[PDB]
Structure formats: structure tokens, C-alpha cells
Design an enzyme around this catalytic site. Structure first.
Site, PDB file in Angstrom:
ATOM      1  CD  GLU A  35      -3.148  -0.779   0.050  1.00 61.04           C
ATOM      2  OE1 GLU A  35      -3.202   0.203  -0.369  1.00 61.04           O
ATOM      3  OE2 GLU A  35      -3.905  -1.742  -0.098  1.00 61.04           O
ATOM      4  CG  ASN A  46      -8.203   6.381  -4.441  1.00 60.26           C
ATOM      5  OD1 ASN A  46      -7.127   6.576  -3.978  1.00 60.26           O
ATOM      6  ND2 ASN A  46      -9.113   5.250  -3.843  1.00 60.26           N
ATOM      7  CG  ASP A  48     -13.624   7.761  -5.284  1.00 60.70           C
ATOM      8  OD1 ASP A  48     -14.520   7.038  -4.569  1.00 60.70           O
ATOM      9  OD2 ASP A  48     -12.726   8.027  -5.062  1.00 60.70           O
ATOM     10  CG  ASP A  52      -6.358   5.303  -0.929  1.00 63.31           C
ATOM     11  OD1 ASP A  52      -7.532   5.145  -0.539  1.00 63.31           O
ATOM     12  OD2 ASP A  52      -6.158   4.685  -1.956  1.00 63.31           O
ATOM     13  CG  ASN A  59     -10.946   6.187  -0.183  1.00 63.22           C
ATOM     14  OD1 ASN A  59     -12.192   6.426  -0.115  1.00 63.22           O
ATOM     15  ND2 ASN A  59     -10.133   6.459  -1.039  1.00 63.22           N
ATOM     16  CG  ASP A 101     -17.346  -2.615   6.952  1.00 66.37           C
ATOM     17  OD1 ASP A 101     -17.946  -1.795   7.505  1.00 66.37           O
ATOM     18  OD2 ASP A 101     -17.670  -2.934   5.763  1.00 66.37           O
TER      19      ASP A 101
HETATM   20 NA    NA Z   1      -6.787   2.081  -2.952  1.00 63.11          NA
END
Ligand code: NA
Ligand SMILES: [Cl-]
Ligand SMILES: [Cl-]
Ligand SMILES: [Cl-]
Ligand SMILES: [Cl-]
Ligand code: NA
EC number: 3.2.1.17
Length: 129
Positions: A35, A46, A48, A52, A59, A101
Site C-alpha cells: 500500500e 483516487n 473518484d 488514500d 480512504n 467490516d
Molecule cells: Na486504493
């Protein structure tokens, strides 16, 4: 801060990530490697419009506030900048919420594509833990 591999393994272990939700320590070290290359200050935009942040590239659409991701949530209740600290506490605490999650560590694309199904224990081999 750019952590060393074993340095980060020890930090993650002291913060309780080894076997958290059944994910052994090497999974978390592998995820951080791919990462962020172990760099707490890493930031990446990102497609959208979210970003990050930090050693685990968490994110802004869901997990932290950066003031520039319209419609987003802040489920870890932190400024995204907190994820860039040399102290990994905020990133660890948020990662624990993320991985609880439903999709587990599949939330991390680099983990899914480069760690899942591999010998992740290699990432902690040789370390004093
Ligand atoms: Na990512
Ligand atoms: Cl492991
Ligand atoms: Cl925002
Ligand atoms: Cl908004
Ligand atoms: Cl730390
Ligand atoms: Na947000």
C-alpha cells in the site's frame, strides 16, 4: 516516517494487529509494504476524488475527513492527516474498524492483489518479535 520491515512488524504487534480478526501479523506488514512502501506520509488520489492516506492507505470516502471528498463519511472520526503521523496508533485503530467490516482485509486492494494467498509469514521472518 519510513519504517523498516521488522520495525513496523514490532509496532503493529504492540498495537495488537497480530491475528486481529484472524489476520496474522504478516498480512498487515505485507499490506503496508504494497500500500505505502512502509511510508506513513504516503497520500494518493483516487479516481473518484477521494484520497488514500498513510501506511495502510485508508480512504477518505468512508473512513476519515479531508474536507474535499463530497458526500463522504468519517467513520474513524479523525482528520485524514492523523493517518500520516510517525506514530501508527490512529492508522491501527482505524484499520481495526475497517477489517471488522464485512469484507475483512479485502478492503485493501494491495492486500487482495499481492498478499492474499501468498506466504505472508515471510514478511515477519527474521524479526525480533
Ligand atoms: Na486504493
Ligand atoms: Cl504471519
Ligand atoms: Cl469531505
Ligand atoms: Cl459533503
Ligand atoms: Cl508507532
Ligand atoms: Na470523508
Amino acid at each position: 516516517k519510513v519504517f523498516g520491515r521488522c520495525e513496523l512488524a514490532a509496532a503493529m504487534k504492540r498495537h495488537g494487529l497480530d491475528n486481529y480478526r484472524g489476520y496474522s501479523l504478516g498480512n498487515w506488514v505485507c499490506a503496508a509494504k504494497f500500500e505505502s512502501n512502509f511510508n506513513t506520509q504516503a497520500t494518493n488520489r483516487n479516481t473518484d476524488g477521494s484520497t488514500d492516506y498513510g501506511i495502510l492507505q485508508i480512504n477518505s470516502r468512508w473512513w476519515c475527513n479531508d474536507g474535499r471528498t463530497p458526500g463522504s463519511r468519517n467513520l474513524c472520526n479523525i482528520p485524514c492527516s492523523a493517518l500520516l503521523s510517525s506514530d501508527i496508533t490512529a492508522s491501527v485503530n482505524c484499520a481495526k474498524k475497517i477489517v471488522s467490516d464485512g469484507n475483512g482485509m479485502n478492503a485493501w486492494v494491495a492486500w487482495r492483489n499481492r498478499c492474499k494467498g501468498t506466504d505472508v509469514q515471510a514478511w515477519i521472518r527474521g524479526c525480533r518479535l
